[PDB]
Amino acid sequence: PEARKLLGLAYPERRRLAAAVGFLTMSSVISMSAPFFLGKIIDVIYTNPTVDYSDNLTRLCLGLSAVFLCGAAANAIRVYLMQTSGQRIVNRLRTSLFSSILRQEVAFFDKTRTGELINRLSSDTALLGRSVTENLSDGLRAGAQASVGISMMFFVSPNLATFVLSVVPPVSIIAVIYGRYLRKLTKVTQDSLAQATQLAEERIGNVRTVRAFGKEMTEIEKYASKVDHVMQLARKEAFARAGFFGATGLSGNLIVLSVLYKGGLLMGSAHMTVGELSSFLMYAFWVGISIGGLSSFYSELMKGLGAGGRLWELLEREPKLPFNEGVILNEKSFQGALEFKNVHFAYPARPEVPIFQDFSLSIPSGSVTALVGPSGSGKSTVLSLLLRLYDPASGTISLDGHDIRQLNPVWLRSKIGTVSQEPILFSCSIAENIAYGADDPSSVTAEEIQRVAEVANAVAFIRNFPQGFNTVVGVLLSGGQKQRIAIARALLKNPKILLLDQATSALDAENEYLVQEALDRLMDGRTVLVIAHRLSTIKNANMVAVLDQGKITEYGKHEELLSKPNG
Ligand SMILES: C=CC1=C(C)/C(=C/C2=NC(=C\c3[nH]c(/C=C4\NC(=O)C(C)=C4C=C)c(C)c3CCC(=O)O)/C(CCC(=O)O)=C2C)NC1=O
Ligand SMILES: CC(C)CCC[C@@H](C)[C@H]1CC[C@H]2[C@@H]3CC=C4C[C@@H](O)CC[C@]4(C)[C@H]3CC[C@]12C
């Protein structure tokens, strides 16, 4: 399956990968052919020179100069085409991943973390794209410079080919192994240092608590001890690197001298001229380079298949709730009547603790009901059940005689709005956080964004801002100012049903007045449900309901329960 998926990924760029491979082949050929011609020139100059050998020098040099230009052109074309293919692949990977991620259900985001998703979107896509394109060329080059070398060595001198084939490979393998060991040691040291840095950051973050308890020196001593541990760890890597650099240089130096000694004692039929010896030396180096070049190809390919395996379950995942599909209703079909019957619910994160049990509730058109009840019971979950973020274990949530499980979730969400105690604002201009509630924000005229600023009592504090409505918030804003901005979105949305969530703690005197006036027109001429924390709006509510033990224990008007004998 992995091979088929990789071929599918590479399919759109075949006409460009084929050309890249074709140019690579010629570049590699010309670069493995060069040493033969260099040896020919050297033998022309120094091996039994004739009376007039200058002409041949010029001719051969001109030929090689002509060849090198073509080689360079092929190399450049390969580089360009190989580097562009990977970018073209990674763009598509990034777009597809993001599109797949942004259409899941909310439970998936509850169990999963954002850091993992961001890491997969930032690094896995790069590794998978680079493994196929920018690594295949390196592997092909390494395989091309390891096969021609042996063939040429046996063509030139069979006697010295056997001797050289019994030295280099062992050294290269030992070097690669050692290097892996060094990498392991470095990783261990870095892990220890990261632990120390995390402790420092944690203790720096909370300084008031540290000073309150007279604990400023113990942290210093602990950090010092952690630093000594890190240094003791690093000494070993220092020793290992010293060994590597002491051994590899000697191994490299002794290889060149052995070939000269061996090829200088060969007399008779097995006699080599200077150019032949130079060619032999060049080919031996090339083979030695090739082995190390080949190892990295396998390493990077394995990492790339790992990254691809990590990526290839998010794209093929299937959402558990329907998105953008269902039925739609006319203008008069809905009057705003919401009916809840026998609802059972429990957060997926902690199924143990139940929240709603035998929940029945009716809200007629044009009626302001208040769900006043004990605090901390999580009655806010009703908002997440009307919007269709979750589903109940057992029950029905019907709107005008139809279960919301058959309605289009995107169309339903438009007709139901909300205002929160702590509105969440994006990193954008103030005007860009008010047009988010319109159907087409890209076609909103500033005439409108001005009308709702006065209605929401926002045009007062905005004017003080030097940039007016272009101020970027994410710029600090007051708690009471965030509210008045939120009502700006609600006014522009123009919902037919409103869900509200009041703040447990009263705001400032200035905010307690401006905010209240704005909400008066947001509760005018619409069906509204108020989850209140204080008895301020309880009297004005048309009806009131008390939620006890996740149930509608009592149902009565403001004076119905107050006038009862048990009071
Ligand atoms: C067997 C593989 C093999 C590997 C992977 C290897 C690794 C290293 N070679 C180094 C230097 C040299 N390399 C060569 C020639 C070959 N390089 C090769 O890859 C093959 C195959 C050769 C001989 C044909 C020579 C003449 C020198 C001395 C040049 C100088 O003075 O530096 C250094 C740096 C040394 C420092 O300076 O600390 C390191 C880490 N050594 C090997 O033999
Ligand atoms: C006759 C030939 C084979 C002798 C070798 C001469 C050339 C090819 C030598 C001279 C210096 C050498 C380099 C010096 C040190 C390093 C750093 C090491 O991390 C990789 C190998 C590398 C890059 C060596 C590769 C080969 C090298 C470039």
Author numbering: 155 to 628, 632 to 724
Text of the article:
Each monomer contains two parts, the transmembrane domains (TMDs) and the nucleotide binding domains (NBDs).
The ABCB10 full transporter binds two BV molecules simultaneously. Indeed, the interactions between BV and ABCB10 can be divided into two parts: The hydrophobic interaction with one protomer and the hydrogen bond interaction with the other. BV contacts with residues on TMH4 (V322, V325, S326 and A329), TMH5 (F398, F399, T402, S405, N407, I409, and V410) and TMH6 (F439 and I443) hydrophobically. Binding with BV bring the two NBD close to about 13 Å. During the model building process, we unexpectedly noticed that two cholesterol molecules are sandwiched between two BVs.
